[PDB]
Amino acid sequence: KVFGRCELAAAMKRHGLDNYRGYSLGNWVCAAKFESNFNTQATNRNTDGSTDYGILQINSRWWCNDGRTPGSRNLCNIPCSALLSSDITASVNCAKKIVSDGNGMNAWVAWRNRCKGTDVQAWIRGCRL
């Protein structure tokens, strides 16, 4: 399903992402906007054969199992399909592991290229949170 901007901000906050590892809610909303356009069902195949899943485009190379990414891991211990649910719990929980991995939100290349350093608070502006 496709979240509204404020609807996703609220859901992310409810699931504990606001200021998680020091990243304000606007960072998370901005990342989701450019990764998936707020669509939980978003998938994209990578050149190496791995696939990115869900609102935060989490990659099967490391984080989830899709049964078709040779040599990969499943560090979030979930089927990649869980990342496509209308319920964002699995995506949020896995994102918390990813952002704790060492490079912070730079793990999301779209965040680094389109969100990092910008006025990310604009993404939650006007939202009842």
mmCIF file of all heavy atoms in Angstrom, residues 23-36 38 55-56 105-106 108-123:
data_model
loop_
_atom_site.group_PDB
_atom_site.id
_atom_site.type_symbol
_atom_site.label_atom_id
_atom_site.label_comp_id
_atom_site.label_asym_id
_atom_site.label_seq_id
_atom_site.Cartn_x
_atom_site.Cartn_y
_atom_site.Cartn_z
ATOM 1 N N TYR A 23 18.844 9.864 13.960
ATOM 2 C CA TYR A 23 18.260 10.317 12.702
ATOM 3 C C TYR A 23 16.822 10.752 12.912
ATOM 4 O O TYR A 23 15.961 9.934 13.232
ATOM 5 C CB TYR A 23 18.353 9.226 11.627
ATOM 6 C CG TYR A 23 19.760 9.022 11.154
ATOM 7 C CD1 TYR A 23 20.569 8.035 11.741
ATOM 8 C CD2 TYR A 23 20.299 9.814 10.133
ATOM 9 C CE1 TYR A 23 21.877 7.847 11.326
ATOM 10 C CE2 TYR A 23 21.601 9.633 9.704
ATOM 11 C CZ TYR A 23 22.383 8.642 10.300
ATOM 12 O OH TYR A 23 23.669 8.463 9.857
ATOM 13 N N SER A 24 16.581 12.050 12.755
ATOM 14 C CA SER A 24 15.241 12.593 12.927
ATOM 15 C C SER A 24 14.246 11.979 11.942
ATOM 16 O O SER A 24 14.623 11.491 10.856
ATOM 17 C CB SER A 24 15.261 14.097 12.716
ATOM 18 O OG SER A 24 15.522 14.373 11.352
ATOM 19 N N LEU A 25 12.972 12.033 12.313
ATOM 20 C CA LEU A 25 11.894 11.482 11.508
ATOM 21 C C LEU A 25 11.917 11.932 10.045
ATOM 22 O O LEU A 25 11.625 11.135 9.152
ATOM 23 C CB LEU A 25 10.553 11.837 12.135
ATOM 24 C CG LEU A 25 9.306 11.079 11.701
ATOM 25 C CD1 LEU A 25 9.449 9.567 11.845
ATOM 26 C CD2 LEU A 25 8.129 11.586 12.538
ATOM 27 N N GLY A 26 12.243 13.193 9.792
ATOM 28 C CA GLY A 26 12.315 13.708 8.422
ATOM 29 C C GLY A 26 13.316 12.968 7.552
ATOM 30 O O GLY A 26 13.100 12.792 6.344
ATOM 31 N N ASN A 27 14.414 12.530 8.153
ATOM 32 C CA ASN A 27 15.391 11.721 7.408
ATOM 33 C C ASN A 27 14.797 10.423 6.906
ATOM 34 O O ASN A 27 15.021 10.031 5.757
ATOM 35 C CB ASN A 27 16.619 11.405 8.254
ATOM 36 C CG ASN A 27 17.553 12.571 8.345
ATOM 37 O OD1 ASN A 27 18.283 12.864 7.391
ATOM 38 N ND2 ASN A 27 17.516 13.272 9.477
ATOM 39 N N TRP A 28 14.066 9.754 7.784
ATOM 40 C CA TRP A 28 13.408 8.500 7.462
ATOM 41 C C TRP A 28 12.319 8.654 6.424
ATOM 42 O O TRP A 28 12.207 7.826 5.520
ATOM 43 C CB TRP A 28 12.858 7.867 8.736
ATOM 44 C CG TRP A 28 13.944 7.470 9.682
ATOM 45 C CD1 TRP A 28 14.312 8.116 10.836
ATOM 46 C CD2 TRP A 28 14.840 6.354 9.549
ATOM 47 N NE1 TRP A 28 15.352 7.451 11.437
ATOM 48 C CE2 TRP A 28 15.704 6.374 10.666
ATOM 49 C CE3 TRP A 28 14.982 5.326 8.599
ATOM 50 C CZ2 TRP A 28 16.694 5.410 10.870
ATOM 51 C CZ3 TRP A 28 15.986 4.371 8.796
ATOM 52 C CH2 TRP A 28 16.834 4.425 9.923
ATOM 53 N N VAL A 29 11.529 9.715 6.541
ATOM 54 C CA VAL A 29 10.466 9.993 5.567
ATOM 55 C C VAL A 29 11.060 10.338 4.199
ATOM 56 O O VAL A 29 10.600 9.833 3.171
ATOM 57 C CB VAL A 29 9.497 11.087 6.081
ATOM 58 C CG1 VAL A 29 8.434 11.417 5.047
ATOM 59 C CG2 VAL A 29 8.818 10.635 7.360
ATOM 60 N N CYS A 30 12.069 11.201 4.186
ATOM 61 C CA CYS A 30 12.789 11.535 2.956
ATOM 62 C C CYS A 30 13.375 10.277 2.286
ATOM 63 O O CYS A 30 13.251 10.105 1.074
ATOM 64 C CB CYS A 30 13.900 12.550 3.266
ATOM 65 S SG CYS A 30 14.734 13.155 1.811
ATOM 66 N N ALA A 31 14.007 9.407 3.068
ATOM 67 C CA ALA A 31 14.586 8.184 2.512
ATOM 68 C C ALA A 31 13.489 7.324 1.885
ATOM 69 O O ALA A 31 13.630 6.830 0.764
ATOM 70 C CB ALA A 31 15.340 7.411 3.601
ATOM 71 N N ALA A 32 12.374 7.166 2.594
ATOM 72 C CA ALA A 32 11.270 6.360 2.067
ATOM 73 C C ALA A 32 10.686 6.974 0.791
ATOM 74 O O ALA A 32 10.345 6.255 -0.155
ATOM 75 C CB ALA A 32 10.192 6.173 3.102
ATOM 76 N N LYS A 33 10.575 8.301 0.747
ATOM 77 C CA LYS A 33 10.069 8.963 -0.444
ATOM 78 C C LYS A 33 10.867 8.584 -1.693
ATOM 79 O O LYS A 33 10.293 8.186 -2.718
ATOM 80 C CB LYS A 33 10.100 10.490 -0.265
ATOM 81 C CG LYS A 33 9.780 11.252 -1.557
ATOM 82 C CD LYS A 33 8.302 11.161 -1.892
ATOM 83 C CE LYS A 33 7.977 12.007 -3.116
ATOM 84 N NZ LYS A 33 6.554 11.844 -3.517
ATOM 85 N N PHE A 34 12.188 8.688 -1.606
ATOM 86 C CA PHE A 34 13.014 8.459 -2.789
ATOM 87 C C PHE A 34 13.348 6.997 -3.033
ATOM 88 O O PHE A 34 13.634 6.600 -4.172
ATOM 89 C CB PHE A 34 14.246 9.363 -2.766
ATOM 90 C CG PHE A 34 13.896 10.825 -2.800
ATOM 91 C CD1 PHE A 34 14.360 11.694 -1.823
ATOM 92 C CD2 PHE A 34 13.076 11.324 -3.811
ATOM 93 C CE1 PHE A 34 14.021 13.032 -1.863
ATOM 94 C CE2 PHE A 34 12.735 12.662 -3.851
ATOM 95 C CZ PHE A 34 13.211 13.514 -2.870
ATOM 96 N N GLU A 35 13.298 6.188 -1.984
ATOM 97 C CA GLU A 35 13.486 4.755 -2.181
ATOM 98 C C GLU A 35 12.272 4.094 -2.827
ATOM 99 O O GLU A 35 12.413 3.283 -3.741
ATOM 100 C CB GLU A 35 13.776 4.062 -0.850
ATOM 101 C CG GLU A 35 15.134 4.387 -0.245
ATOM 102 C CD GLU A 35 16.314 3.910 -1.083
ATOM 103 O OE1 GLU A 35 16.106 3.193 -2.086
ATOM 104 O OE2 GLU A 35 17.461 4.254 -0.721
ATOM 105 N N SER A 36 11.062 4.435 -2.355
ATOM 106 C CA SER A 36 9.855 3.684 -2.743
ATOM 107 C C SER A 36 8.659 4.535 -3.139
ATOM 108 O O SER A 36 7.615 3.984 -3.479
ATOM 109 C CB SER A 36 9.411 2.802 -1.583
ATOM 110 O OG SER A 36 8.953 3.645 -0.532
ATOM 111 N N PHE A 38 6.877 5.885 -1.057
ATOM 112 C CA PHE A 38 5.957 5.534 0.048
ATOM 113 C C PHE A 38 5.108 4.279 -0.219
ATOM 114 O O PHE A 38 4.110 4.027 0.475
ATOM 115 C CB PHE A 38 5.015 6.700 0.406
ATOM 116 C CG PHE A 38 5.705 7.983 0.809
ATOM 117 C CD1 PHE A 38 5.104 9.202 0.502
ATOM 118 C CD2 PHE A 38 6.897 7.995 1.538
ATOM 119 C CE1 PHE A 38 5.691 10.414 0.877
ATOM 120 C CE2 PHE A 38 7.487 9.212 1.928
ATOM 121 C CZ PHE A 38 6.880 10.417 1.603
ATOM 122 N N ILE A 55 9.301 -0.167 1.579
ATOM 123 C CA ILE A 55 9.345 1.293 1.693
ATOM 124 C C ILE A 55 10.751 1.858 1.792
ATOM 125 O O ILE A 55 10.989 2.988 1.379
ATOM 126 C CB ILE A 55 8.507 1.861 2.875
ATOM 127 C CG1 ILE A 55 8.942 1.280 4.226
ATOM 128 C CG2 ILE A 55 7.042 1.694 2.622
ATOM 129 C CD1 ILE A 55 8.444 2.075 5.464
ATOM 130 N N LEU A 56 11.667 1.068 2.354
ATOM 131 C CA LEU A 56 13.055 1.474 2.485
ATOM 132 C C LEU A 56 14.008 0.641 1.615
ATOM 133 O O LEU A 56 15.230 0.686 1.767
ATOM 134 C CB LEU A 56 13.479 1.477 3.955
ATOM 135 C CG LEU A 56 12.897 2.662 4.744
ATOM 136 C CD1 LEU A 56 13.077 2.423 6.237
ATOM 137 C CD2 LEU A 56 13.572 3.979 4.336
ATOM 138 N N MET A 105 22.818 6.109 7.996
ATOM 139 C CA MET A 105 21.853 6.112 6.905
ATOM 140 C C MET A 105 22.517 6.158 5.540
ATOM 141 O O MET A 105 21.839 6.066 4.522
ATOM 142 C CB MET A 105 20.816 7.229 7.065
ATOM 143 C CG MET A 105 19.791 6.946 8.148
ATOM 144 S SD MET A 105 18.321 8.021 8.027
ATOM 145 C CE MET A 105 17.423 7.253 6.660
ATOM 146 N N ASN A 106 23.842 6.269 5.502
ATOM 147 C CA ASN A 106 24.546 6.168 4.224
ATOM 148 C C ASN A 106 24.337 4.812 3.541
ATOM 149 O O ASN A 106 24.596 4.694 2.341
ATOM 150 C CB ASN A 106 26.038 6.461 4.389
ATOM 151 C CG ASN A 106 26.302 7.880 4.847
ATOM 152 O OD1 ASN A 106 26.129 8.852 4.092
ATOM 153 N ND2 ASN A 106 26.738 8.009 6.095
ATOM 154 N N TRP A 108 21.604 3.679 2.740
ATOM 155 C CA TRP A 108 20.625 4.016 1.716
ATOM 156 C C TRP A 108 21.239 5.041 0.779
ATOM 157 O O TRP A 108 21.322 6.223 1.092
ATOM 158 C CB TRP A 108 19.333 4.538 2.360
ATOM 159 C CG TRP A 108 18.546 3.477 3.059
ATOM 160 C CD1 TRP A 108 17.631 2.621 2.487
ATOM 161 C CD2 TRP A 108 18.616 3.116 4.444
ATOM 162 N NE1 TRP A 108 17.120 1.773 3.435
ATOM 163 C CE2 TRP A 108 17.705 2.046 4.645
ATOM 164 C CE3 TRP A 108 19.359 3.591 5.545
ATOM 165 C CZ2 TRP A 108 17.512 1.446 5.889
ATOM 166 C CZ3 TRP A 108 19.163 2.994 6.792
ATOM 167 C CH2 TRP A 108 18.241 1.932 6.953
ATOM 168 N N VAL A 109 21.697 4.584 -0.377
ATOM 169 C CA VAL A 109 22.353 5.486 -1.315
ATOM 170 C C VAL A 109 21.457 6.685 -1.695
ATOM 171 O O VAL A 109 21.965 7.812 -1.771
ATOM 172 C CB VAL A 109 22.945 4.723 -2.532
ATOM 173 C CG1 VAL A 109 23.456 5.689 -3.592
ATOM 174 C CG2 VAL A 109 24.092 3.805 -2.064
ATOM 175 N N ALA A 110 20.152 6.455 -1.862
ATOM 176 C CA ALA A 110 19.196 7.545 -2.153
ATOM 177 C C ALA A 110 19.128 8.556 -1.007
ATOM 178 O O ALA A 110 18.959 9.753 -1.249
ATOM 179 C CB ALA A 110 17.818 7.018 -2.498
ATOM 180 N N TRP A 111 19.235 8.088 0.238
ATOM 181 C CA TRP A 111 19.344 9.037 1.355
ATOM 182 C C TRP A 111 20.609 9.890 1.245
ATOM 183 O O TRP A 111 20.548 11.112 1.363
ATOM 184 C CB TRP A 111 19.294 8.341 2.722
ATOM 185 C CG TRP A 111 19.476 9.317 3.862
ATOM 186 C CD1 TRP A 111 18.499 10.053 4.465
ATOM 187 C CD2 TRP A 111 20.708 9.674 4.519
ATOM 188 N NE1 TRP A 111 19.041 10.849 5.442
ATOM 189 C CE2 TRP A 111 20.389 10.634 5.502
ATOM 190 C CE3 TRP A 111 22.046 9.284 4.365
ATOM 191 C CZ2 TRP A 111 21.355 11.204 6.339
ATOM 192 C CZ3 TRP A 111 23.000 9.842 5.196
ATOM 193 C CH2 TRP A 111 22.654 10.800 6.173
ATOM 194 N N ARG A 112 21.758 9.252 1.019
ATOM 195 C CA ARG A 112 23.002 9.995 0.885
ATOM 196 C C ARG A 112 22.896 11.016 -0.245
ATOM 197 O O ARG A 112 23.295 12.154 -0.080
ATOM 198 C CB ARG A 112 24.197 9.058 0.667
ATOM 199 C CG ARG A 112 25.525 9.771 0.555
ATOM 200 C CD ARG A 112 26.697 8.791 0.538
ATOM 201 N NE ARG A 112 26.525 7.745 -0.472
ATOM 202 C CZ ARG A 112 26.730 7.894 -1.782
ATOM 203 N NH1 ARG A 112 27.115 9.062 -2.289
ATOM 204 N NH2 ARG A 112 26.536 6.864 -2.595
ATOM 205 N N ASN A 113 22.331 10.601 -1.373
ATOM 206 C CA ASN A 113 22.335 11.459 -2.559
ATOM 207 C C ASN A 113 21.239 12.516 -2.593
ATOM 208 O O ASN A 113 21.398 13.538 -3.265
ATOM 209 C CB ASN A 113 22.325 10.618 -3.839
ATOM 210 C CG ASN A 113 23.633 9.881 -4.062
ATOM 211 O OD1 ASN A 113 24.706 10.345 -3.665
ATOM 212 N ND2 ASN A 113 23.545 8.732 -4.732
ATOM 213 N N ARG A 114 20.135 12.296 -1.874
ATOM 214 C CA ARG A 114 18.974 13.173 -2.035
ATOM 215 C C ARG A 114 18.443 13.776 -0.749
ATOM 216 O O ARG A 114 17.696 14.752 -0.803
ATOM 217 C CB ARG A 114 17.870 12.441 -2.787
ATOM 218 C CG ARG A 114 18.365 11.878 -4.121
ATOM 219 C CD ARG A 114 17.317 11.074 -4.813
ATOM 220 N NE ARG A 114 16.291 11.934 -5.412
ATOM 221 C CZ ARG A 114 15.349 11.478 -6.224
ATOM 222 N NH1 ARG A 114 15.318 10.187 -6.531
ATOM 223 N NH2 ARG A 114 14.450 12.307 -6.745
ATOM 224 N N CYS A 115 18.843 13.222 0.395
ATOM 225 C CA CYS A 115 18.304 13.659 1.687
ATOM 226 C C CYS A 115 19.357 14.254 2.601
ATOM 227 O O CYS A 115 19.123 15.270 3.263
ATOM 228 C CB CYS A 115 17.644 12.487 2.416
ATOM 229 S SG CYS A 115 16.243 11.785 1.526
ATOM 230 N N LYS A 116 20.506 13.592 2.667
ATOM 231 C CA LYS A 116 21.587 14.000 3.534
ATOM 232 C C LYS A 116 21.940 15.480 3.352
ATOM 233 O O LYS A 116 22.188 15.952 2.236
ATOM 234 C CB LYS A 116 22.787 13.110 3.255
ATOM 235 C CG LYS A 116 23.950 13.312 4.189
ATOM 236 C CD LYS A 116 25.110 12.441 3.768
ATOM 237 C CE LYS A 116 26.236 12.470 4.790
ATOM 238 N NZ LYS A 116 27.357 11.564 4.354
ATOM 239 N N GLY A 117 21.927 16.202 4.465
ATOM 240 C CA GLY A 117 22.288 17.614 4.470
ATOM 241 C C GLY A 117 21.199 18.586 4.067
ATOM 242 O O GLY A 117 21.387 19.796 4.173
ATOM 243 N N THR A 118 20.071 18.070 3.592
ATOM 244 C CA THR A 118 18.972 18.924 3.160
ATOM 245 C C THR A 118 18.043 19.250 4.322
ATOM 246 O O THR A 118 18.189 18.713 5.427
ATOM 247 C CB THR A 118 18.158 18.259 2.029
ATOM 248 O OG1 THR A 118 17.402 17.175 2.575
ATOM 249 C CG2 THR A 118 19.074 17.747 0.926
ATOM 250 N N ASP A 119 17.073 20.126 4.068
ATOM 251 C CA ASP A 119 16.068 20.464 5.057
ATOM 252 C C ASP A 119 15.040 19.334 5.181
ATOM 253 O O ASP A 119 13.885 19.461 4.768
ATOM 254 C CB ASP A 119 15.399 21.801 4.675
ATOM 255 C CG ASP A 119 14.378 22.274 5.700
ATOM 256 O OD1 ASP A 119 14.422 21.837 6.871
ATOM 257 O OD2 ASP A 119 13.527 23.110 5.316
ATOM 258 N N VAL A 120 15.474 18.228 5.779
ATOM 259 C CA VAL A 120 14.618 17.041 5.918
ATOM 260 C C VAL A 120 13.377 17.252 6.805
ATOM 261 O O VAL A 120 12.403 16.505 6.706
ATOM 262 C CB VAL A 120 15.421 15.811 6.418
ATOM 263 C CG1 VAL A 120 16.475 15.384 5.377
ATOM 264 C CG2 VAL A 120 16.048 16.110 7.792
ATOM 265 N N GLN A 121 13.395 18.270 7.665
ATOM 266 C CA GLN A 121 12.242 18.543 8.514
ATOM 267 C C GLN A 121 11.010 18.923 7.680
ATOM 268 O O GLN A 121 9.864 18.728 8.126
ATOM 269 C CB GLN A 121 12.585 19.630 9.533
ATOM 270 C CG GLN A 121 11.556 19.826 10.633
ATOM 271 C CD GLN A 121 12.155 20.452 11.882
ATOM 272 O OE1 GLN A 121 11.663 20.239 12.995
ATOM 273 N NE2 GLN A 121 13.227 21.223 11.706
ATOM 274 N N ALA A 122 11.243 19.430 6.468
ATOM 275 C CA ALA A 122 10.144 19.750 5.553
ATOM 276 C C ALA A 122 9.252 18.529 5.308
ATOM 277 O O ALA A 122 8.064 18.661 5.028
ATOM 278 C CB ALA A 122 10.679 20.294 4.235
ATOM 279 N N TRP A 123 9.822 17.332 5.436
ATOM 280 C CA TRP A 123 9.067 16.096 5.180
ATOM 281 C C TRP A 123 8.017 15.774 6.240
ATOM 282 O O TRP A 123 7.096 15.002 5.993
ATOM 283 C CB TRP A 123 10.018 14.905 4.984
ATOM 284 C CG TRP A 123 10.726 15.034 3.692
ATOM 285 C CD1 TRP A 123 11.996 15.476 3.496
ATOM 286 C CD2 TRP A 123 10.178 14.779 2.393
ATOM 287 N NE1 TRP A 123 12.286 15.498 2.158
ATOM 288 C CE2 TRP A 123 11.188 15.087 1.452
ATOM 289 C CE3 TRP A 123 8.930 14.332 1.934
ATOM 290 C CZ2 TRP A 123 10.997 14.941 0.071
ATOM 291 C CZ3 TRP A 123 8.729 14.200 0.553
ATOM 292 C CH2 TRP A 123 9.767 14.514 -0.358
#
